[PDB]
């Protein structure tokens, strides 16, 4: 219909075609810079392309105009269709669906939120004239839930999908069904370091557009050996380049927050020392993190301080960042980009169903990204502090899909309320292995949250608006039951964070000793709660409970982090309407109300003992030879107990231990322990025992 060449007129034109206002003389000069892109020499290809294909794979270099200037290619080309609907464009982060969606709004000579505009989880900078929205991938996943098919969007264009994340993956996986079920509907799927050939194989062959060519050079500069500490390599590198390298800003990657504000702080300290000892320039030095307030995250985009004086060695600009800033930005002014080569990535330990952060080499695709961040206006330098030959031999080619490293049966409830109906062949690009999917599939059957014929139930609803393993959710759901709510609230937390025991080879001894006063003799579960009491009880007197944990031989990191989770699950409790509840502390039954409320998340994580006095226990699933593990505080375990975690080294244990009574299973989970249906067995036998024991003892009373 409507070709590049006839779009370039109406972009020429005095008239905005959008507003009806006059186009300003600023748009002209952006708009002089934007044709000199290289996506703009293929601007016909891609009309081409895009008429004729449902589907797009898009590769082209960093800074070759994909975010910006293809999306406002389909604006032009969609509007005479009268569709009234709209083009999506996912960011992986919030800082560059905000930015882009600005710089787009100057581009195209509109006021950000009403033609161009963007929708994050908590605001919707958009209105009813927006035709362009860029976003996260996780905000158009919450309106896939609200929206299965997507009805207000006529492109929805996948940016940096690469990533491989949970909510990437899974927005591929919904919009190539949709796609057949929605004709109307374009897909864009691009990134500037893609395997191009997997991702047109799983959008049904879908033809690949590959514009070449860059804006500007980044020179990648390799070290000649490797260093350890990173940190110290990378603040190094920051001050040798404003003592001797020309005007430019820097950009330098770290892991975290705590590492990222002791780095600024080192930085400053020591550009202060070069300022009044050497003339050197002055530099201003800021951080940049996702728990950063929005407005303090904006202010990477200030401009870089003066000289001293005319003449001077130039002013300059660090921004020191985690991989937010890895993809997606353009920020004006930066030449240099100092790639230590390391990111906090998530883990997930299968024996504690816990997901964690882990600081890890990043992939060739994050290195690439990161030295991207250059060359986009000016000439740029990235100082990767590694060799070359641990780029090329030790460094993987992609980061591995965040759903291979995520809980399973999280994902599998977020799936329920999106509307899948078939689990096992639901077609995403990695998938988990069939037996990996069905077993999830059966703990959230046997934990009630999916009925017999995998539907949600609404135990299961509510259970997913836990950031828990669900597990642990039904265990906090089913709290008030027991009379525990504020304790298990406390214990839900600690189980959902790696373990807080501190044992380090040199003072072992001294962390036993300190374990001893929160050493509960019938579990585990109960010795976890009383660490976490006194931390709480120290940090109420105003303790430093960093000193605190070390001298008691706890996880500060850990610790806090399930505080904080705490928190978050008391405000879910409390509005999903779920009551906090104790029982005190001196009741007959305050410790066996807490042992028995384990039961409703872990009747699954049972084991007997096999003899009157043997050692070895078995499991209710699977029917493992298990050991309990001698880190307990159980000093005589019952016949029966509740574990947290399975472990396999040269021996196998159940570590996490406490002490229950078998008609507690009986009771919690009748579903589970039907014996009618139970597996036969010297398990099966026991506890028909104990269920003929209560008949016998129930029968004689009644008489
Ligand atoms: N905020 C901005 N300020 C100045 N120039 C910008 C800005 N955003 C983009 N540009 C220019 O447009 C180019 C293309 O940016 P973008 O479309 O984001 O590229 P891509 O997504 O392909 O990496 C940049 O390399 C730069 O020259
Ligand atoms: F590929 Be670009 F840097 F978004
Ligand atoms: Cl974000
Ligand atoms: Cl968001
Ligand atoms: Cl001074
Ligand atoms: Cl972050
Ligand atoms: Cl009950
Ligand atoms: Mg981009």
Known sequence: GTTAKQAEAVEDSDINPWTGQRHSERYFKILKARRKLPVNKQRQEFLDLYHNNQILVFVGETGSGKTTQIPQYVLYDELPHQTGKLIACTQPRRVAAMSVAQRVADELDVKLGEEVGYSIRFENKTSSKTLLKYMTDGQLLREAMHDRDMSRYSCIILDEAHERTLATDILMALLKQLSERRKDLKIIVMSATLDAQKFQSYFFNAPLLAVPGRTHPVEIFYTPEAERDYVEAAIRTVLQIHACEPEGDILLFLTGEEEIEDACRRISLEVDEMIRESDAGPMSVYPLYGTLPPHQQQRIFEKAPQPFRPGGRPGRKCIVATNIAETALTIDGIVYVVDPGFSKQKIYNPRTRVESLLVSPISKASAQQRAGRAGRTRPGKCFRLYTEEAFKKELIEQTYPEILRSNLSNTVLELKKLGVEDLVHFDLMDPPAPETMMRALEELNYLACLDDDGELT????????????????????????????????????????????????????????????????????????????????????????????????????????????????????????????????????????????????????????????????????????????????????????????????TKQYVRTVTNIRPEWLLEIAPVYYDLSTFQKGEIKNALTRVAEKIRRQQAMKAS
């Not at 836990?466 to 089913?478: E, N, R």
């Not at 585990?524 to 070390?550: F, I, P, Q, S, V």
Request: net charge neutral; proline share 5%.
């Open 458 to 649: 609404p135990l299961g609803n509510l259970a997913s608006e836990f950031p828990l393993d669900p597990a642990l959710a039904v265990m906090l759901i089913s709290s008030p039951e027991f009379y525990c709510s504020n304790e298990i609230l406390s214990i839900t937390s600690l189980l959902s964070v790696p373990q807080i025991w501190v044992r380090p080879a040199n003072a072992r001894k001294r962390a036993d000793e300190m374990k001893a006063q929160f050493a509960h003799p019938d579990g585990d579960h109960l010795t976890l709660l009383n660490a976490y009491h006194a931390y709480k009880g120290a940090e109420a007197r105003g303790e430093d409970m960093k000193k605190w944990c070390h001298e008691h031989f706890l996880s500060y990191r850990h610790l806090s982090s399930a505080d904080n989770v705490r928190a978050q699950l008391k405000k879910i409790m409390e509005t999903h309407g779920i009551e906090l509840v104790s029982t005190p502390f001196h009741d007959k039954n305050y410790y066996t109300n807490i042992r028995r409320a384990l039961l409703a998340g872990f009747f699954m994580q049972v084991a007997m003992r096999e003899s009157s006095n043997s050692k070895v226990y078995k499991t209710v699933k699977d029917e493992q030879l298990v050991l309990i593990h001698p880190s307990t505080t159980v000093t005589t375990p019952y016949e029966w107990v509740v574990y947290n975690e399975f472990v396999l080294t």
